[PDB]
Amino acid sequence: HHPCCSNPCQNRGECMSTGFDQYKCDCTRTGFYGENCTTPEFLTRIKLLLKPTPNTVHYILTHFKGVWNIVNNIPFLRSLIMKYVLTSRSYLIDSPPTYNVHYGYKSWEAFSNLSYYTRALPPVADDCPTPMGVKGNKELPDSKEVLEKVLLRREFIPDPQGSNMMFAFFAQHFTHQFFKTDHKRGPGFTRGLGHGVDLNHIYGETLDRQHKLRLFKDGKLKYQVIGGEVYPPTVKDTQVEMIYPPHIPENLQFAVGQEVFGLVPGLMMYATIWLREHNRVCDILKQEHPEWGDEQLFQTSRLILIGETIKIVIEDYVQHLSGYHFKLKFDPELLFNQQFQYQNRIASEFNTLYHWHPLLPDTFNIEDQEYSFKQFLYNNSILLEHGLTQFVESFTRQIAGRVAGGRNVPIAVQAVAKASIDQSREMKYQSLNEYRKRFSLKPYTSFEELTGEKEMAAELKALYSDIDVMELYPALLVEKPRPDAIFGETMVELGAPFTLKGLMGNPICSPQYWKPSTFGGEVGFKIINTASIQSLICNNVKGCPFTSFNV
Amino acid sequence: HHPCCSNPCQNRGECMSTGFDQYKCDCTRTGFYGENCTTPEFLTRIKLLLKPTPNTVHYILTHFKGVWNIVNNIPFLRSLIMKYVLTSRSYLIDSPPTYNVHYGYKSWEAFSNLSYYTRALPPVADDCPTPMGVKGNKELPDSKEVLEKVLLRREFIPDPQGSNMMFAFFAQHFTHQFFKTDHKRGPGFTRGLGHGVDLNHIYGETLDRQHKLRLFKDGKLKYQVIGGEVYPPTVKDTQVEMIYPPHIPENLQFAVGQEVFGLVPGLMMYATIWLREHNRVCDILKQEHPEWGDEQLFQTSRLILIGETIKIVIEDYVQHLSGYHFKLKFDPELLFNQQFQYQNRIASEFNTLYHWHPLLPDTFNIEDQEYSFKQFLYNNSILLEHGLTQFVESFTRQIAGRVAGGRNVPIAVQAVAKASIDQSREMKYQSLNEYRKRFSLKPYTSFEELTGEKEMAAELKALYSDIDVMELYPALLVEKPRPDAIFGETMVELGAPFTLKGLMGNPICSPQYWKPSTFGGEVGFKIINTASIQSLICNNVKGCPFTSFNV
């Protein structure tokens, strides 16, 4: 078998076979040397001694509220700290990207072919004696058994951070522009060839689809008016393909950028909000530029919405998730004197870690109704019936489920959770502890350490035998959460670098794009730099209801 | 008409219309302010004071040969200066890219759509009152008159820098992997979606084509043996489509990565040399790695050949063109502590400036034969008749034509030269002086200043009337050359940033790729770092004839 099966190279050293039974570690620029890249250089020694752990930094960022209140109001300091946040997270991501599901070594194919998700760790080689390389049993435990024993919800566990359904559906809507797995090809393939925040879930992945969605007057997107309210146009009207069961009535077959967004009225809520926002920004730009044509209105509005999206994701969405007292800032200028690559390739593991199934409630509570999954799925009539204002008011008040801490996956989506496990295995993912090392975390030394409790840990112990072959995805959902938090350490330490890299990597953050003229002048630039989840709702939903990502 | 038609914003300020008759300039980070971005900040004043002209720096780099001999032998010093060369040129190229033929403003469409060449300057708006904006006559002069008066060769003018046919065919072969105009869409579109040095002209642009060219044993490319010599395989054998006239026999339809390389036996010469090189590197890698399969052998060989190509282009090809006594260095590590974007998008103007028609001789002289263009075109029998060794010996000794200085386009390709002019106009290129300003050069203030002589200048004056509406492409070919040089200032000052960006922007130059393990270990890595045009020929051409890019 492949001599690198055991993953012998540490500290980001790269493993290469040098014969049938021999390997060589390439320790270049790792800060370590020796056979397995485990002997630290002197400066590396010092650095390691001084480095606080991720849990320590998390403690600091979530305490001393008085101090952060001062820091937050000293722009120089706020900028200083945010600069540090951006730069330290980014170093963990290979950019230009490297591996993918078919290439455990760098290749022009893996670099150039955008149909692949990229990989933060190379796959376990096909001929390794065990699924995780050399450790563990010949087969991993039955995925249904892992699912039933430690993932399925017994009783709803609410998020102690107060995340609500506005949050849950924003997470789903936002991330499905770049997690678009191409199941015709396989789980390691994506249909999202822009690999980031291009808002294809609003505008369409292809030019053909975009043009069917556009009005070609005033830069705007097509729409329909039902009971005096603006909604996306129909499939019949646009000839845009959408996934809908055959029985859905014509006028409820809403057509939007992302073909799966008819699946859940919570997605169509945001689809409708962002469609209205696009047209609103068209109106503003036309006021500023009576001389502009439809094409420039459309394109400039799209760039503005991309900026608004990134703004909201950082200052509302990530802000909420982080639990930090420090106020995060979206400010491309902070990187202009830093080394940083304005590009991004979506990693398969980023997709996997974002399978936040436990967020989903047992029922969807709108106004005085409590809809089951069966009632809610593919049912845009609920959106029409209640209207956006009531959707916002209701989802803002409904709490979502805790993601870490175990046993909180709703049985309604059990097949999705099992598939997350099965697909990780098909894609030959390395173990939890290999991923922890890859992101500079200490490997767990026991199952009890992983979960922080005894019952689930004993079940995992009997299932997996060795903590070093525990899998990434189930581990994320059973991990001991941070104190009163929605996530554990692994989720945050992998998720944050992928996220900040996907946001800041966008060309609109680069110096030649980040200027008022890109956005039609100071008026457009201001729309981006003042964007918030509250103003998005206030501008586009009748009655300007209060909203936020916490109950 | 568009109020930015006059190109009012200077110093890279960005022009935006603000009503039908008004514009505003965005002076962000230009170092200037004021209505047209012409008022310098104080720092800017200081910089412009201590900034030597490109002609001054050229003088320094092409004199004091004894001093440069010292410098070239002090690795620290050589590195410092090469680092400066790389970084100063870099800043002139927008990366991530901005405009294209259809977008004179930034847009997601121009950013994301790889089928376009990008644009260093936006196109002149469709409704401008003159072709160059507002200056000049309502129509540009007849392109036939420009061609006949100042571009067509009377007597052959040899390159005083001594460039030979090995050089001219290397230029064509190398650049045609990323200048691949998609004529069914238009001159502003490319089929080269890799936008750089990906060696698609050897391996094919698509996976389907690559797989048809590959042997699938030992990592190798398919080949044929004729009279004991290795050549590319046939169209019949591979089912690879190639462009050939109907009268070419089956056995002479060589199939290579780039569909057009059957056009010219000098291109097939290099195609054969590089195919041999790939298979040679496969043999070396297999010796190092008896455990590797075909796929990894093939992929790793490709990365090595990409590295070899960049190495040769910098240290032999650009070295020769430059005329510098300073010894240029291919060393990705020079950029690792610098701000630099590892990506590239091919500019239309980079394609246009590379239409080095005047390089071509009146006849192609191999052994004791002198082939006409009609005899030479599409005639791979010439290659088989003389063999590669004789091709190399002959083309190494045949001098090429001077590109700048005027009246040196061979009549055989007059239609190609006229097309360069016409297609620049179709793509609505701004004027020579706009491009000069765009690349920090002083606008020419007369036709005489442009040409350095009186006769062609007075022709051009009669044709164009105003030096500020002189066109870029014909100006490159008539420009006053540097002393005894192949090119004038404009060609170099535009071509060098585009070139160094296209070379260093490659992912193999990034720190996660530039490691021996990427290239199968220290032996594979050393192939890149010791590559040269001479070694490429020595290893792959019977007899190891001497070669270089000068006669």
Ligand code: COH
């Ligand atoms: C982030 C939060 C989130 C939420 C709230 C959510 C809510 C819901 C929901 C009802 C509200 C339903 C019925 C589903 C059901 C599904 N989800 Co999610 N999903 C979420 C994150 C994801 C991600 C990430 C993917 C994978 C994307 C890909 O590759 O297509 C996904 C994929 C799926 C798939 C495709 C299965 C596959 O193998 O790719 C189904 C089915 N789902 N999910």
Ligand code: COH
């Ligand atoms: C750099 C030197 C160079 C040389 C030596 C050279 C040598 C020769 C040669 C005989 C040896 C012949 C018969 C031609 C003839 C042609 N050249 Co060149 N070409 C060169 C650089 C280019 C470039 C660059 C293009 C545009 C490429 C595109 O968009 O495909 C080009 C395009 C062409 C075209 C198509 C026109 C177009 O609009 O693309 C023809 C025909 N030609 N050339």
Ligand SMILES: */O=C(/[C])[N][C]1[C](O[C]2[C]([C][O])O[C](*)[C]([N]C([C])=O)[C]2[O])O[C]([C][O])[C](O[C]2O[C]([C][O])[C]([O])[C]([O])[C]2[O])[C]1[O]
């Ligand atoms: O789509 C999949 C999973 N496989 C395709 C393959 O797809 C390529 C993927 C995976 O290799 O990588 C990225 C490539 N994208 C680009 C832009 O290069 C994809 O093309 O493409 C192969 C070749 O096109 C397909 O294999 C073909 O081979 C046979 C011909 O000998 C056919 O009979 C096959 O059915 C198929 O057409 C492969 O299916």
Ligand SMILES: *[C@@H]1O[C@H](CO)[C@@H](O[C@@H]2O[C@H](CO)[C@@H](O)[C@H](O)[C@H]2NC(C)=O)[C@H](O)[C@H]1NC(C)=O
């Ligand atoms: C490099 O890593 C290998 C593991 O892949 C080390 O070999 C192991 O060493 C431990 C402790 O010394 C033993 O318990 C194992 O039995 C060894 N396994 C194998 C497969 O050899 C090796 O010692 C490391 N090299 C260095 C210099 O530390």
Ligand SMILES: *[C@@H]1O[C@H](CO)[C@@H](O[C@@H]2O[C@H](CO)[C@@H](O)[C@H](O)[C@H]2NC(C)=O)[C@H](O)[C@H]1NC(C)=O
């Ligand atoms: C890149 O842009 C080109 C030019 O707009 C696109 O080509 C057009 O595609 C539409 C359908 O989407 C066709 O109807 C036109 O015939 C095409 N025009 C030309 C000039 O070729 C191309 O689709 C775009 N590429 C992507 C990936 O969107």
Ligand SMILES: CCCCCCCCO[C@@H]1O[C@H](CO)[C@@H](O)[C@H](O)[C@H]1O
């Ligand atoms: C919705 C949960 C259905 C579980 C069906 C499979 C039961 C196997 O799971 C068992 O469930 C018990 C009850 O929570 C636990 O006490 C055990 O630790 C667990 O192993």
Ligand SMILES: *[C@@H]1O[C@H](CO)[C@@H](O)[C@H](O)[C@H]1NC(C)=O
């Ligand atoms: C869809 O929602 C409506 C309420 O708008 C509800 O009455 C209906 O039963 C739902 N449909 C299904 C199939 O559950």
Ligand SMILES: *[C@@H]1O[C@H](CO)[C@@H](O)[C@H](O)[C@H]1NC(C)=O
């Ligand atoms: C700016 O340039 C325009 C040319 O369009 C010129 O008319 C005007 O005087 C300039 N303004 C200043 C302040 O120099």
Ligand SMILES: *[C@@H]1O[C@H](CO)[C@@H](O)[C@H](O)[C@H]1NC(C)=O
């Ligand atoms: C092709 O080249 C051969 C020499 O190899 C020459 O004899 C022949 O005439 C050429 N063909 C044409 C059409 O000129």
Ligand SMILES: C[C@H](COCCO)OCO
């Ligand atoms: C999962 C990740 C957590 O970030 C929180 C701290 O940055 O954010 C969402 O993408």
Ligand SMILES: C[C@H](COCCO)OCO
């Ligand atoms: C035209 C340009 C000149 O380069 C010389 C660098 O000093 O090179 C093209 O690759």
